[PDB]
Design an enzyme around this catalytic site. Structure first.
Site, mmCIF file in Angstrom:
data_model
loop_
_atom_site.group_PDB
_atom_site.id
_atom_site.type_symbol
_atom_site.label_atom_id
_atom_site.label_comp_id
_atom_site.label_asym_id
_atom_site.label_seq_id
_atom_site.Cartn_x
_atom_site.Cartn_y
_atom_site.Cartn_z
ATOM 1 N N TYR A 122 0.810 -1.216 0.000
ATOM 2 C CA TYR A 122 0.000 0.000 0.000
ATOM 3 C C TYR A 122 0.847 1.272 0.000
ATOM 4 O O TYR A 122 1.440 1.641 1.018
ATOM 5 C CB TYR A 122 -0.922 -0.033 1.230
ATOM 6 C CG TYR A 122 -2.049 0.981 1.258
ATOM 7 C CD1 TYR A 122 -2.315 1.808 0.167
ATOM 8 C CD2 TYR A 122 -2.870 1.092 2.381
ATOM 9 C CE1 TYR A 122 -3.374 2.719 0.198
ATOM 10 C CE2 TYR A 122 -3.921 1.992 2.422
ATOM 11 C CZ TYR A 122 -4.172 2.802 1.331
ATOM 12 O OH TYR A 122 -5.229 3.682 1.368
ATOM 13 N N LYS A 159 -1.532 -1.412 -4.235
ATOM 14 C CA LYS A 159 -2.589 -0.412 -4.259
ATOM 15 C C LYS A 159 -1.809 0.890 -4.394
ATOM 16 O O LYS A 159 -1.123 1.319 -3.463
ATOM 17 C CB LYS A 159 -3.420 -0.381 -2.973
ATOM 18 C CG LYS A 159 -4.621 0.547 -3.134
ATOM 19 C CD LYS A 159 -5.293 0.936 -1.829
ATOM 20 C CE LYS A 159 -6.327 2.029 -2.104
ATOM 21 N NZ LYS A 159 -6.847 2.681 -0.869
#
Lengths: 296, 295, 294, 293
Positions: free
Chosen positions: C135, C163
């Site tokens: 992330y 992500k």
């Protein structure tokens, strides 16, 4: 003494007439006014002199006139910096020709340049300064160039560099620079932290507010030297009350306006896109001019 | 003293080989600080690794420190969490344990409006049931950038008794002092202590105080006596040390020095913090011996 | 199959006393499924995980699994500043049957890149088999990674996706160029269409809770070479995002969901404040509009 | 009509760093021959900030002689100084340019109101030529809000905006607020995505060597052929990857030198020369591009 660049030196403003052209009479008056208040020297053609809204010839004209007015009387440092190395080289040769004690150059801006390119830039200007010590100019806030300590250490150790104008509020780096270079001439660049800057390691300063109250900064230097912290703090506080106002009005134009009320500058305008001072600030600026004149 | 002004050490949290609280070392560190002649302790802040600690673990430290120093030196409990409710729980515990004040970093990670920041502090002050609040401004780590006007509003909220200013902007430090002549203002960056005091701070809170708090006390004394030279020399010595701690990692470096001083059993920080690089051990051991000889 | 697709970043409904509203959480999960979402990203920024205890985060993971495991993909964000706390949540995610785990770069304290790598490795170890979704969200975490560092993280043993909460579409393209098979989630809803064109093959976003079908429609439109439709859908999504930014994103979404009869009490946890009452008319109308359209 | 794909023109210099007029003319004609819609002259790419005013006017005049009436010509007359910017604007009018442009004044901080008067004054001196507002926060250090951008683009006399920003949410917002605005994508490396977000054209330095690829992306997207648009953007980015390594302007001049368009591939100091380790790749790129089109 004959070659000592340490001290309190005013970043000189450039007076313009109603048509935005150089006001020669006002410039000469400003120079004498600075000398009169016991300033150690003048930093000419820097950001404060609106050099970046002037052509090369206009900058040389200012340098030349200032030299005629103050060479010999006080120290003179010529900021010859331009984005272009060639242009900077031209100004450097002129500075030497006019008899300045040193040259200075802001790190070239707008375009991203490698550190090596910055170094060769300084080397080339130093060559053209032919003998005049170079004052490295670190002002990340305006230039957008962010040097590390190791990079700063490299710059100040280049042959021909005799000083560093540290326009940074990081007083930890100021102390580190002093520790690494015990003999380096180190100018505090932000007037509003002068006292603290000297305490951290700077041994002098260059600033635009010196034009209207340079004696206060001299007073701080003296106070700290004699161990009078109370006085040093008191003087810095009074300087900051003034700086608070100048930040609201606009620093360069606010200073020109105060100098105007002190009968030094005929027309207090800066060059476009700089606008005029908001009239709501005139009462405070007039009151300040009156106070400073009584104080001096 | 009858006030919160002074030199307060930001307390480190000693852990064992299993990354669990080492109470024995914690007590030793608290007594070590008292012996150095520190004015007080700031517990549960960044330096105490509070943000890699659970709420109950932070509370455990507060209880033990109180048992060790309450009534001997001033005790400030940093109860700040991103959550207001969690911050309030710790404030209530700090009150119960008898701390002299509470403190809270501006809530981070999520962006909050200034009004929300204000209500955050009001809520915690309520739970502190009388203990004064020490607003904590540290933009470099919180990511929260407050204007001077906002800082003035925060420090004048009902129940706020001080400001821990972890900022290197000394123009702002002076402005804060000029606006609030009686405010307790702690300098936050150890490496500019002397300059911070000259600018307006009347004290300080720092992690390096754990190993050389007497030096900072010395700078305060020197400046009060108008001995600029001594103040500068002391600051230079502190910075020589700080240069090293920044290379090794500040918290783990400090704990390692404390280890060689026979205070901390295991100088580990909690993961993701890694260990100290072995190549630095010689310098850290030499520093500890230098400091012990100095005392 | 795989983890590619449009995943909604799940919100956490609270009751009057700021406690988990189980009934509303269940309704929200089923609501997302009914919209045809490909999966759910649980326990992330959007779920207000950073103002929740480990126990509370686990409770949410467990409920969501009870409601959707086997129906849609489930990604458990187990990230905490502490590695040990992160590992605890990872172990629980495995226990509950999630399809993967994810972790934001630890924040607040500055950590070296190597420390960041070791952090992910430890969590991956505790995930005991579940693939890790790295992330990257510099804006909120403060961690600024270089492309080479991103490349290193995405190729760590056990990492299966990224992500990318970044508006740098040059880096998005570079990442896709370097890793042709990587699952790449677009993180900023307001640039979804452009992100997919740059290289992302899916996305994770909070606004998917109230209009996920629109993002699914953009994926389809581009896939079929219908640029105009993809653009119009993005514009409609941005009109909504414009409003949500004024009202506050999470609370604004919960308020819309409230008018959709999904969330009982649309409040976020303090220090988050309530929605300025002056925005209620717009939010209610939006809810009405979306229900009609849907 | 100022919509389209237009190359940010480079300024060729000789071994002594002076303008190389013959190469300048060759590059102008080269761009024309490869189908570019027009040229953006005297901008960052033309090394205008390491040139004097007289030098910038010299370039504007020569380009006009070479291409006026053949392709669109936009003159970047921006300087920190308003007065200087006005002189260049008046000259651009005399030379027959189709439009003028100005980067937000930099170095010194200026209020938004001061920025607005700056443009108005330049617009006045442009005596009829529409103004292309130039937003480039990364280099100018000037960060404008959406509201401020809207105010600038709505000023009397403004006919376009060169958006050198990677924020595609704002790009979409600008397009939504101004349905008919000529909006140039500024970062070549996100061209495709910038168009999808709302840009209806672009201005960039890499157009000098592969402008047709950008023309191709415009065509691809219009024809709903995502596959080709993406492939073209990817090939552009492989090249941009290299140019960032070598230094963009000097890398481009080097490629153009190997194509026999530019006599000497140097930029003005403080810009340094290209590292020799990159020549093999630059020569190969030049060969590839010449054989490609």
């Amino acid at each position: 003494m004959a070659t000592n660049l340490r001290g309190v030196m005013a970043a000189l403003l450039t007076p313009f007439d109603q048509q935005q052209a150089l006001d020669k009479a006002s410039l000469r008056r400003l120079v004498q006014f600075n000398i009169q208040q016991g300033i150690d020297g003048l930093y000419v053609g820097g950001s404060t002199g609106e050099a970046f809204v002037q052509s090369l010839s206009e900058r040389e004209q200012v340098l030349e006139i200032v030299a005629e007015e103050a060479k010999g009387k006080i120290k003179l440092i010529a900021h010859v910096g331009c984005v272009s190395t060639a242009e900077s080289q031209q100004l450097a040769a002129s500075a030497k020709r006019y008899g300045f004690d040193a040259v200075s150059a802001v790190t070239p801006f707008y375009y991203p340049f490698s550190f090596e390119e910055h170094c060769d830039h300084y080397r080339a200007i130093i060559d053209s300064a032919d003998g005049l010590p170079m004052v490295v100019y670190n002002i990340p806030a305006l230039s957008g160039v962010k040097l590390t300590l190791d990079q700063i250490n490299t710059l100040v150790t280049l042959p021909g560099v005799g000083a560093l104008k540290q326009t940074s509020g990081d007083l930890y780096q100021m102390e580190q620079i002093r520790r690494e270079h015990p003999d380096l001439v180190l100018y505090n660049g932000y007037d509003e932290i002068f006292a603290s800057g000297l305490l951290a390691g700077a041994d002098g300063g260059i600033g635009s507010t010196y034009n209207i109250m340079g004696w206060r900064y001299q007073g701080i230097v003296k106070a700290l030297k004699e161990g009078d912290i109370q006085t040093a703090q008191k003087l810095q506080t009074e300087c900051n009350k003034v700086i608070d106002l100048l930040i609201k009005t606009g620093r360069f134009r606010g200073l020109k306006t105060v100098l105007h009320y002190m009968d030094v500058v005929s027309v207090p305008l800066c060059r476009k896109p700089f606008g005029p001072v908001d009239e709501k600030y005139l009462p405070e600026l007039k009151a300040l001019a009156q106070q400073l004149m009584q104080e001096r």
